[model samples]
Target chain A: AKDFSGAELYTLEEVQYGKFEARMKMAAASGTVSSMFLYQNGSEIADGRPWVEVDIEVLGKNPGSFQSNIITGKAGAQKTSEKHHAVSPAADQAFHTYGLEWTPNYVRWTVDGQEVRKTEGGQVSNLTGTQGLRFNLWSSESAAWVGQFDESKLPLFQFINWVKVYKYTPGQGEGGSDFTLDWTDNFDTFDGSRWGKGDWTFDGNRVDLTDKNIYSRDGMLILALTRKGQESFNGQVPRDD
Target chain B: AKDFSGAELYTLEEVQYGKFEARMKMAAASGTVSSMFLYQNGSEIADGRPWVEVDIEVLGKNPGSFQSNIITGKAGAQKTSEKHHAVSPAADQAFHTYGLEWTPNYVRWTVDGQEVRKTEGGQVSNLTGTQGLRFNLWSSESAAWVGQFDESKLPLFQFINWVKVYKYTPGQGEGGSDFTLDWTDNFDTFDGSRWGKGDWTFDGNRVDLTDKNIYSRDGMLILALTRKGQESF
Candidate 1:
C-alpha cells in the first residue's frame, strides 16, 4: 500500500500558560481532521511527567461541528474528555477564529471569541508541563471517530490566515486584562526561529506529515493532504500502488 | 549638559538590494528628525569598503517636506547628494507610506507608492555591501541642517504602524515581478530575533539613543525624543 502525505506546523518554543488563537478555514473531506492544539509528549516520564494535550479539531465528516478534547496521563493509561460543539456557517465554508485558553486550573475553548466549552478542577490539575502550539491536517483510520477513508478527496487544504499568541498576565489588558500580546504571525513569511514543520507520522494517522505539504502563500498558511507523488497544487489524483 | 534620550530601531540582519517601506507619522518639532534609512558603517575599511546610506528624513523644521539623500565614500571624505520634496497635508499631520527601493544600479525614493525622487548610475553603483534597515527619532546640533534645538518640545514622538521587507527577485511577483516579500512586522509586539535597539550617539547628533525610548504600544512602534529622565512612555 502507498502512503498519504499530510502537513503539521508547530511552534519551536514551549509555552506554559497562554491564549492561542488562529483564523482558519478547515478542509472539508471525510476521514480527515483539521486541528489547532497544544501538545506535550511524555518525554520526561522518568521524572514523573505525563503526556498532555488540549485540542480543537474539526472532523471532516461533520464540518459544521467540532470536538474540544483534553487528554492527560502517561502513554499506557491516558484519559480523554471530549465534547462536540456546533459552529455557524460551518468550519470549512468561511474563515473563523478558533481559540484555546489554557491556565493552571482550567482549559477553555472558544470560537469567534465566544466560549463554547470549559473544563476545570479535576483532571485539569494533571495537565502539567509546557506545551508547543500546533496545527495539522491528516486523515484517521478510526471509522467511528472520523468516518471511513475517502481517497477521492485526496488533495484538500486547510487555510490559516493568522495566528496570535498571548501571555497569561494577571492584569495586563485594557480593563485589568488577563492576557498580553506576545507575538503574532500573519503568515507573510515563515519564521524558522519560531516554528518548525513536522516530518513524522503516528499510529492511526493515515498520512505521513511532510514538509512539502506545508506552505505560506497569498498571506495564508496552507496545509495540504495529498497522496504520494501528488504533492504539488496541480492536477494529480490518487492511484493504486 | 543634560542629555536628551532618543530612539533607534534597526534590523539585526543586513540585507542588500530590496524594497523597504514603512507607514509612519512623523514628529512635529524643530531641530528634530524622524527618519527611515538603510545604513552601513564602514567597519570593514581594512577590506576597502566605504560607508553607504540611503535616507528618507522628515526634518521637523519643515513639516511639509522631506529630504532624500545618498552618502558614499570614507568617513572624512564622504560625498552626499541630497534632494528635498514637498509632501501634501504635511508629514506630521497624518500617517504616510514612505519607501526606498535600492537595486544594484539605482536608488529610488517613493511616497505613498509614487516615486518622488530617484538617482541612478555612477555614485549609486558605489553602494556596496549589506545595509540594515532603520527608523530613528533624534535631535541635531547643526542648526542649519535641522533648525535650532528646541528644549520646549521635549516629548515629541514618531509612530511607525508597520514595516515590510522584500527580496529583490527579478521575475517573481505578479506578471513580471521585481520583488518578493520576505517579512513584515505589524508592530503588535517587537520580535527581538529580527530587530535590536540602538544605544549610541554620534557627532552632530544631540540625543543619545536609548532602549527606554523605544517601545511598541497600541499596535504601533513609538520612537520618542525626550528629556534625560523622561524615557518611559
Candidate 2:
C-alpha cells in the first residue's frame, strides 16, 4: 500500500556559496529520511547537469545514522560522492547541530562543529551558480533502501530547533571561509515571511498543505504524522494569542 | 604516464538552493570530460557514501554527448540515477546555456531552459544542505571511459561567457522580498574577489593555478589547455 506522508520548508532566497547549519531532532523509524540540504534548479541550457544538490540525510535505521552527499556533473555523466556517519544520542533521541561549509577550493561537512567530510575539485569544479535551503521528512521510495515502512508507527514526528547561515568569504586562504551569521531561525514562532511550506505524500500516506501537520509550540517547529481524526489534526495558524 | 592536466574555478561561497546557470563552450577532444556540477567532500571516512555529488558531464567520445545524474545511499547501497542527451549544435561546436533547478519536491535540469531530467523523493529527499559552484576540464580517469587522450590537440579551450542565478521562492503565495540579484560573475574582468583559481591533474596534463592559465578578456573567462612554453612536448 502507498502509505507515506512528507513535510518540508525551504528558504526564499538562493544562497550563492555559504555555510548552512541546522539544529534538530530526526523522525525515528527504519523507513524515513529526515534531511536538510541546498538545491539549485537545473544547469545552464546546453549542459547536462540537472540541479546542484548537497545533502545531510539521516536514515531511520539502527541507532540513528546519517549520510553527507554531493551531486554534480552533466547528464549521463552525473556523479554522486556520499559518506555515512554515526551520531551519539541518535538523530531522534537528542538535537544535534549539522553544518555544511561550501567554498571554492573545498566543501567541508560537520556534526556539532566536528569535521565529518570534505570534497573538492572534479565534481565540485562542475558546479556553476547558486542554491536554496531546505529541510524535509518523508518515507523511502525504496523497500530495500530504507527498510520497510511500519504502519504501526504511522504517525511519527520530526523536530527542528533552528537554522543558521554563514556567508562565505574567499581569500581568507584555503580550508575555511570568513563566514558571518547571515540569518537565523529559532522557531520560537513560525515566520511565513521567511519560509514557504508544503505537504507531500509517498503512496497514500500524504499530508495536506495546512497547519494540521505542522505547528509551533514551546519554542519548537513540529511536524507530526497522525491519523485523520487525530487530536493534532487541528490545522490552525497562530494568531494574536 | 599520467598525461593529463586540468584547470578549474569555483564559487568562493557555497550555495544552499536556487537556480544555477552558465553560458559557455566546451573543449573538443576524445578523452575528456567537460563538466558543471555540485560537490561536498569527505568520503574517506568509515562510511560508504563519503560525499554527495550531482553532475552534467560531457564525454568527448563518438559524436560527443552528455548525461545528468544524482548519487545517494551508502557504499554498495549507493545509487546514481542518470540519463543521456543529444545537443543541437553538436556541443563542442558552439556555445550554450545549461541550468539546474532544485527544490524540496524535485530537481529538474535544463538545456536553454528546456527540461531534460527531474529527480525526487527517497534519495532526492535524502539530499540535504548546499554546495559550491564549479566548472572543470579534465581527462577521464578511465581509459575505457573517455577514449585515449590525444596530445595532438594540446591547446584546446573551454569558454564561459557569464553565469546568472535566480533565487528560488517556494510558493510564498506569489513572492515579495528584497531579493535583489543574489550574485553574478559576468567574467567581464576576472575578479579574484569571487573566484578561487586552482591547477589540477587527472593524468599529467596540468594547468597553472595562477593567472597565467586563466584570464578574462573580451567579456569572457578563458580556460585553455596548452603545454609548457606553448609548444606541445
Candidate 3:
C-alpha cells in the first residue's frame, strides 16, 4: 500500500461532536493481505497519552480469497473477537463500498452499505478515559511479504478509489454538538485563553471599561457580560489602542 | 508496530474458496492504527514479492472515514490501492459483518450479507490469478511510536473474535477437474490438490505410483513433484 500511497486518495475533513460517515470501494489483490480502518484520540496523544483504534483487514493467499477481518484498540490496546465468519468467496467478483461510522459514544462497521460490526465508545471498560477525534490511514503492505512469497510474483500493489468524512456539527438540528464540541473543532489551533487556560487579569479603571464583557480579571473561567456599559474596579484613565 | 513485531496472536486455517465475515467492536487511539484486514500470500514473503492482499484500515483523523485497500502481484512485481473510503457514524452504531466471498472466478466483499466489492480471478487485467490457501493473524506496533512514543504504552495488542474460510464445492459437477480448494480440513490434515495442483503425474500414471510416472512425457510442465517420478523418463 505504501508503494502506491496516493495523497488525495483519502481526505479527513468531517468533524464535530456527534456522528460521522464514509463510503468507499475496496482494493483487491493476490499473494498478500490488505486493509482499511480508523483511529482516533484527544490532544493528549500528541503529548504521549492513551488513544483508541478500530481495524478491518482483507486477506488471502492469493487475490482470490479476499478474506476480511476486524480488530480494536483502547489507550493503545485491543479487544479480541472470539469468532469470525467467511462469505461465499468472490473478492474479484466486483467492486463494492465499505463503511464505518463513529459517534461520541460508539462505533459501527458495514460493507456495501450493510451492517457488519458495532461497539460502545464510552461505556467500554477500556477506552472510556480518552476521546477519539482524528483519522489517518496506514498505506502499507503486510510484513509477511518478507520470506513467504513466490519470486515469480514480486512487486504487489494496493489501490484506493475515494474517501469522505462527515463531522458531528451541533445546532445543525438533529445533527450534533451538545455544547462541548467547540474545543474539539479547533483544539489544534488553540492559543490557550479561549479554553480558560493560563493566568489571566484585567486592566483599566472603574469609569472607562464596558460593563458587559468577559473582561478577564484572571485566567480561571468564563464570565458573562451585561449592558451597564461596563467599568473597572476603580476609576482610571481611558484605555489605549 | 516494531515493538510488537515477531509475535503471533493466532493461526488461520487455509481454505480454497468461500465467504468469510467478522462483526465486532474495537478500541482505537487517534493516529494509533490497527487494521483488522485479511491476510494471504505464503507463510513467508521473500524478495519483496508479496503473495497478495485485500483489506480495510481505520483512520485516526476521522473515524467516519475508514479505508479499504488491495495489493496484487505479477511476474514478481506488486501494486497497492489509490482511492479508499469513509464508513462511519453508522458503522459505529452497531455490530455489522464485514465480509469476503472467495470463488474460482471472483472474490466478493459484503457487510451483513450484502455485497460491497467484487474482484476478478483469471488472467485478465485486474486480478493476480488463482485462489488462496493460507490464513493467519498477527498484532504489531512501534513504527508510529518510534522516536515519539513513551514506550510505556508499548506492547499494544490486536484482538480477533472469529476466523473462518468457506470453500466452493461442487457435488456432481463436471469440468471442475480444473478447480479445487484449500489444503486444510475440519479434523486437521491436508489435500492441496486444488486448481490442478497437489495431484500431479510425472509420465502417464498416478503420482503415488512414481515407478510408472514419466517426466517430460508429453511436453507438460510440473514445477516440483519429480524426485522419484523422474529417472524413469
Best by DockQ: 2
Q: Please give the DockQ score of every candidate, comma-separated.
A: 0.01, 0.02, 0.02
- What's the C-alpha lDDT at position A92 in model 1? 82
| Model 3: per-residue Cα lDDT over A151-172, one tens digit each | 2332222222223344544445
* Overall lDDT per candidate, in order of appearance: 0.82, 0.66, 0.34
Worst 10 residues of 2 chain A by lDDT: A232-241
Q: What DockQ does predicted model 3 obtain?
A: 0.02
TM-score of each: 0.50, 0.47, 0.30
Q: How close is candidate 1 at the interface, in terms of C-alpha RMSD after superposing the true interface residues? A: 24.6
Per-residue lDDT of model 2, residues A129-221, tens digit only: 888888776666465556776647757777777889878876463455457677888889888888777654433223333345667776678
Tens digits of per-residue lDDT for model 1 on B137-214? Answer: 998888898899888977998999999987675554433557767689999998887788989887788889999999
Q: Residue B118 in model 1: shift from native, Å?
A: 1.1
* Clashing residue pairs, backbone N/CA/C < 3 A, model 1: A173-A177
Sliding window of 10 residues with minimal summed lDDT for model 3 chain B: B1-10
Q: For every candidate, what is the interface RMSD in angstroms?
A: 24.6, 11.0, 16.3
Q: In candidate 1, how many Å is residue B16 off?
A: 1.4
The alpha-carbon lDDT assigned to residue A26 of candidate 2 equals: 80
DockQ category of candidate 2: incorrect
